[PDB]
Amino acid sequence: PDTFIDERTLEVFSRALNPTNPMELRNLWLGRVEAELGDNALRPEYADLWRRSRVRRAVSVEEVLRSTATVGMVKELFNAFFRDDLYGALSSKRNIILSSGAVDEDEYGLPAALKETLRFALARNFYGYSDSLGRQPAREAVAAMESVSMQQGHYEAASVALTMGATHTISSLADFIFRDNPYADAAICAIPNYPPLVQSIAWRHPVLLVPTPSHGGTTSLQALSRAVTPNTPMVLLQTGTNPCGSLVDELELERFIQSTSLSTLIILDECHEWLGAPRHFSPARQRANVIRVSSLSKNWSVPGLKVGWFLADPALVSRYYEFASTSYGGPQSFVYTLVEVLARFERWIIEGRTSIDQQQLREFSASYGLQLGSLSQTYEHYVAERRAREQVLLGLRGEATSCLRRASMIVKTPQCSINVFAQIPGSEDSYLSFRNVLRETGVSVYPGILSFYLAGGGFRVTTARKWGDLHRGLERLSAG
Amino acid sequence: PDTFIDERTLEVFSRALNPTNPMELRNLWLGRVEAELGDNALRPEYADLWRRSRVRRAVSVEEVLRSTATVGMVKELFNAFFRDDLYGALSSKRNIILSSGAVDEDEYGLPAALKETLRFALARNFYGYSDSLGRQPAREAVAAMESVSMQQGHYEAASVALTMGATHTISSLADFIFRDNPYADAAICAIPNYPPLVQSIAWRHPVLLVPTPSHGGTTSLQALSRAVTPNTPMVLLQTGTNPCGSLVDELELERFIQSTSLSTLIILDECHEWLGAPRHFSPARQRANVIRVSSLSKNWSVPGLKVGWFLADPALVSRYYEFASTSYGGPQSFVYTLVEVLARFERWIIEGRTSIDQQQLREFSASYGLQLGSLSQTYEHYVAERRAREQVLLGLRGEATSCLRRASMIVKTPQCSINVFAQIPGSEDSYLSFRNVLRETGVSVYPGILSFYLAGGGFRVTTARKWGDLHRGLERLSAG
Ligand SMILES: NC(=O)c1ccc[n+]([C@@H]2O[C@H](COP(=O)([O-])OP(=O)(O)OC[C@H]3O[C@@H](n4cnc5c(N)ncnc54)[C@H](O)[C@@H]3O)[C@@H](O)[C@H]2O)c1
Ligand SMILES: NC(=O)c1ccc[n+]([C@@H]2O[C@H](COP(=O)([O-])OP(=O)(O)OC[C@H]3O[C@@H](n4cnc5c(N)ncnc54)[C@H](O)[C@@H]3O)[C@@H](O)[C@H]2O)c1
Structure with a gap:
């Protein structure tokens, strides 16, 4: 079952000096994660801050979900993930990025028909x-x-x-x-x-x-x-x-x-x-x-x-x-x-159209100077390119789901999009899993805390990457 | 001397049912303008609204400038000018647009060197x-x-x-x-x-x-x-x-x-x-x-x-x-x-550079694949294109100032940009002048009320147009 919040989430909010402050909440959340990283802590300043923290209030589940600091704390962790951790201190050219959440533009980009319309706008000012x-x-x-x-x-x-x-x-x-x-x-x-x-x-x-x-x-x-x-x-x-x-x-x-x-x-x-x-x-x-x-x-x-x-x-x-x-x-x-x-x-x-007659060409204006032969060929190639992209992305998503399940990892079956949510057994912190997986395997994954999963240790894996990068990332995920 | 506000501006604010309401202020301002247009009123509904209005308060100069309705009223007139008057009811293909305030993209557009960088980004995704x-x-x-x-x-x-x-x-x-x-x-x-x-x-x-x-x-x-x-x-x-x-x-x-x-x-x-x-x-x-x-x-x-x-x-x-x-x-x-x-x-x-050596090429990254011969030629042609554009735009601005002054109109000498502010003698309403000039001459001008000139009848003339359009617009401005 999906876990959204538990007693572990309330621990951070309970020890905060100012529970309204989003920066103090982020430091405690990062401090607890880096406390478990004994000899692998990136920033030891936050690790000591969590150690000195003391419980000073009682926090309920309803309080966390009705607080603007919870949204702020997650957004600060969102900011710290990109500019401070993934592309900051731990930035490396040998990292495999499986946390982007976006389709690879260099491999699966805009169709040539749509890229032609941008060059047409440039020529026509x-x-x-x-x-x-x-x-x-x-x-x-x-x-x-x-x-x-x-x-x-x-x-x-x-x-x-x-x-x-x-x-x-x-x-x-x-x-x-x-x-x-x-x-x-x-x-x-x-x-x-x-x-x-x-x-x-x-x-x-x-x-x-x-x-x-x-x-x-x-x-x-x-x-x-x-x-x-x-x-x-x-x-x-x-x-x-x-x-x-x-x-x-x-x-x-x-x-x-x-x-x-x-x-x-x-x-x-x-x-x-x-x-x-x-x-x-x-x-x-x-x-x-x-x-x-x-x-x-x-x-x-x-x-x-x-x-x-x-x-x-x-x-x-x-x-x-x-x-x-x-x-x-x-x-x-x-x-x-x-x-x-x-x-x-x-x-x-x-509508299921395969060929373009004069009725469809008349929908566009005459200022474009469209021809029947060129428009029909452009649309047919656009259909093939869109259908080809759909099949490759579906195959990569299915292949990643099976390969990641073969590594004894709990994986939810996706029904849409390009993302697959998985969790290593025994994991309780999603951000800690990101730090551990990136240090050992070298693959970057998107923690669930950045998706408002305040509880659990699951992470997001983006399967819409190049096959060379996706296969290598999956191979080291299983080995690690 | 520049006129920003006078007793004529305070008349609209004094007769308003709700002076805070920006829509009521805009209707009164448009109603007064369309009241002077006896047989040429575009919307007679607003003309009758102004006639029935009566003075019901005292308005000072300081009140107008410290009210958010004054900014709202001008912005509503800004909206009514474009979608309701210029490109709405009075939209016509025979109109000469001298109120855009922007450089003609089809005649004076982006340099080819800068347009090449947009095609390069398309190819490199x-x-x-x-x-x-x-x-x-x-x-x-x-x-x-x-x-x-x-x-x-x-x-x-x-x-x-x-x-x-x-x-x-x-x-x-x-x-x-x-x-x-x-x-x-x-x-x-x-x-x-x-x-x-x-x-x-x-x-x-x-x-x-x-x-x-x-x-x-x-x-x-x-x-x-x-x-x-x-x-x-x-x-x-x-x-x-x-x-x-x-x-x-x-x-x-x-x-x-x-x-x-x-x-x-x-x-x-x-x-x-x-x-x-x-x-x-x-x-x-x-x-x-x-x-x-x-x-x-x-x-x-x-x-x-x-x-x-x-x-x-x-x-x-x-x-x-x-x-x-x-x-x-x-x-x-x-x-x-x-x-x-x-x-x-x-x-x-x-810096006054005319040629490009290896020192300047090293500023760009090696991923672009820039060559010394191609970069030097591109920069030199960019300089010529930018200098040519500056001279033509300066000539059009100077030519418009002299020709429009020859029509016995008070014109302020411009020191920068592409705009020239003029006023027909005897004019007291800028929006009314826009309606009168567009009806008689057929040329559209930018009223000063849209530039927060609450008083006066001056209007903005954009001189950065094609010479064919600019000359015809100036010719009918003098004749009218
Ligand atoms: N991936 C996400 O979902 C996401 C979300 C938020 C922020 N970010 C930000 O994304 C950034 C990724 O940076 P990066 O390592 O790709 O390097 P980068 O910042 O140099 O380039 C980022 C992207 O910009 C584009 N780009 C445009 N012109 C370019 C040019 N001339 N040269 C190169 N790229 C050009 C490319 O798509 C490129 O991948 C990080 O700073 C990160 O914080 C990413
Ligand atoms: N000029 C200004 O300062 C200004 C300020 C605010 C709003 N506007 C709005 O500007 C609009 C001007 O509309 P218009 O009469 O130029 O017609 P339009 O709305 O059809 O086209 C407007 C502009 O869009 C661009 N464009 C991009 N792709 C285009 C395409 N495929 N076909 C045509 N143009 C394309 C062109 O630069 C064109 O001149 C009005 O609706 C007006 O309210 C103008």
């Missing part, structure tokens, strides 16, 4: 000022793409707002939602989640953390449904769960969505709902209080392009126009052609 | 996750570029934080500064300014508007210096003033900077300090409380790329790392090569 919500033909293409996946209903361009990635989208949404929001109940964030997203929400409003366990690759929203109140301002939930790779059932999601008041905005993080997800969305996903956020960083492996959008009610998108104009002025006009081509190519794939 | 403050070699190049322009002192890579444009930078800075800022005095924004920047600051803290008049192309900070208090949280000021094109004297800026306490952060908007500006910065610009914000949107004419950075104290940049990671995760990794090449090319130009 398509990098001027544009609308705050995005160019209108780009939004129209996105709406058509999202409509064919719905069981019933369609989407309009007034429901689409292009943004600069999912991290910026949710951060922008939280600031926009909590301007003068009358509802004073704590915002609900479902864990496991992404610390940058949770910390951004904790910036504006107090946050309640609700565990969302998974059983057999199925994400359970039973605990989430009970915690949601009629006065809840917002809810952040992943349809495809990270790091375990579990997936939310459509009927359970539909029942949970329909059981909430219209004043409770539901943010659906759909960045991991791919590579095995049956994307047949119920009409409840188009409810007035539902906001669907997606990004190109994982599915198309372009995190450095900062391209994304969200779907909401047309009245909400109209209000967001004023926020986007002031906050950043508008999205990237350089990638408007890429978004329009991506949305129309994906929509044709869902 | 340089669109992955990166540091929250930017890639280290990119920041090192920027610091070297900024150091050669200083009269004394140098910059380090710890003082550089890459961001996604100036609008996003100032919006991010305002949120970062006002997290738990103890100083409760009103933030000071110098007008004329950019409504998106002022509205973003008004989001976090109350704002005081301080007029910053110009005389003979010289921006006067005498009024700004008196308004600044030891408890002032932040000050937003443009070194190159928009729309008039005036410039701040270096000695006056140095005296103003050195006369402020270290607790008053000074944001220097330097996006218009080019095309005639003597960029010889005093050491006071490197003070611990000074933040220098720049962008590539105007000087390099790439607003759609969202590329920029700011310079601050190394201690402030370190704290900003946590904010950038949560707010948006980090800057655009796709443009890292462009930033590094831009910064090193500009630094060589300032």
Whole structure:
């Protein structure tokens, strides 16, 4: 069963001088981890700090999940992991990085059809000022793409707002939602989640953390449904769960969505709902209080392009126009052609189209100068490249699951995305396991504490790497 | 003399039902403008609303400049200008756009050397996750570029934080500064300014508007210096003033900077300090409380790329790392090569280098595969392209000033940037002049009310357009 918090987590919060301070909590958490590393402690200053700590209060489970310091402490550990541990003191060229959580851009990158649209925008000087919500033909293409996946209903361009990635989208949404929001109940964030997203929400409003366990690759929203109140301002939930790779059932999601008041905005993080997800969305996903956020960083492996959008009610998108104009002025006009081509190519794939006639070419404008022969060949090669990428990534995920289970390690079966969650038997600290595995085997893994797994010793393994690196990393994981 | 506010501005605020409401103020301002348009009123609903309004309070000059509704009203007029008037109801393909305020990307675009670095990043798949403050070699190049322009002192890579444009930078800075800022005095924004920047600051803290008049192309900070208090949280000021094109004297800026306490952060908007500006910065610009914000949107004419950075104290940049990671995760990794090449090319130009030896090539890494022959030719052609662009833009600005003065219109002589501020004699409303000029001549101009010129009827004319469009626009301006 999934473990989210236990008595070991409460020990750090109980000995803190100031439990509200996120820096003191991070130092104690790092101090305890480095105390177990007797002769292998990287920073002995924190190890002595934990030794001198003394229990001075009683901490309950409810206190930890309702504290903004818990989100802050995890985010500080998130910061210390990258710039202080993985790419800082312990940075090495001989390390095998299995903790990135992103698809290898050099091996599995953007398709050549989509890279051609970026060179086309460069040649046409398509990098001027544009609308705050995005160019209108780009939004129209996105709406058509999202409509064919719905069981019933369609989407309009007034429901689409292009943004600069999912991290910026949710951060922008939280600031926009909590301007003068009358509802004073704590915002609900479902864990496991992404610390940058949770910390951004904790910036504006107090946050309640609700565990969302998974059983057999199925994400359970039973605990989430009970915690949601009629006065809840917002809810952040992943349809495809990270790091375990579990997936939310459509009927359970539909029942949970329909059981909430219209004043409770539901943010659906759909960045991991791919590579095995049956994307047949119920009409409840188009409810007035539902906001669907997606990004190109994982599915198309372009995190450095900062391209994304969200779907909401047309009245909400109209209000967001004023926020986007002031906050950043508008999205990237350089990638408007890429978004329009991506949305129309994906929509044709869902409809099962194999060849392109004059009807599909007429969807694009005449200013592009598209030809029937060139567009048809481009789309067919795009389909083959996307299907090939899906099969290789599925094979790597399955191969990693079997190889890592052969090393007598408890592994949860993934249902979507590119991540596999595993745990060495007898491990109780996820950050300590990262330090131990990196020192002995030389492979870096993503600790579960960075995924809001306050308890347990499981870690995330990213299987969407080059086969040469992935095989070597798995080989030393079994040997170690 | 410059007029910022008068009795005509106070009339709108006095008749408002709710003076705090920005929408009511915008409707009255638009209603009065459309009341003068007897048979030419675009929306007669607002014209009747102004007629029925009655005076119900007394409004002073100090009340208008200390109200967040004044910033909101101007920003609503900013929104109504673009999506409701220029590109909405009155949108037409026969209109000549002289109100964009940006360099024509199709005619005067990014240099081919800088466009080659974007195609290089595409081929090398340089669109992955990166540091929250930017890639280290990119920041090192920027610091070297900024150091050669200083009269004394140098910059380090710890003082550089890459961001996604100036609008996003100032919006991010305002949120970062006002997290738990103890100083409760009103933030000071110098007008004329950019409504998106002022509205973003008004989001976090109350704002005081301080007029910053110009005389003979010289921006006067005498009024700004008196308004600044030891408890002032932040000050937003443009070194190159928009729309008039005036410039701040270096000695006056140095005296103003050195006369402020270290607790008053000074944001220097330097996006218009080019095309005639003597960029010889005093050491006071490197003070611990000074933040220098720049962008590539105007000087390099790439607003759609969202590329920029700011310079601050190394201690402030370190704290900003946590904010950038949560707010948006980090800057655009796709443009890292462009930033590094831009910064090193500009630094060589300032030093007066004409040829490239092995010493300059060694500054770049060996992973780029740069050759001595190719790099030297690329830099020399980049210098010629940048110098050619400067001369044509200067000629268009000078030609527009003389031709538009020949039409018996009061024109302020510009000292920098690409904008020229003019006023038809007898005009008292800037927005009305925009409606009248667009209806008769067919040329669109940028009203001064959108530049926080609450009084007067002057408008901004953008001279950085194609000569065919600029000449036709000037010809119908004189005829009309
Ligand atoms: N000019 C300003 O200072 C300013 C400021 C704020 C908002 N705006 C917004 O600018 C918009 C201007 O729109 P528009 O009439 O240029 O049309 P548009 O919205 O179709 O295109 C705007 C710009 O997007 C870029 N672009 C990128 N990919 C493109 C593609 N495939 N096809 C066409 N353009 C592409 C080009 O630079 C183009 O000029 C308005 O909606 C306005 O509200 C302008
Ligand atoms: N992987 C993650 O999920 C994640 C999350 C948060 C932060 N980070 C940050 O990612 C960084 C990774 O740095 P790194 O070791 O890859 O080195 P780096 O910082 O030099 O390069 C990072 C990435 O930038 C891109 N890039 C763009 N232009 C480039 C150029 N000219 N040369 C090289 N790369 C270029 C590439 O995708 C490259 O892999 C760390 O600083 C880390 O803190 C990673």
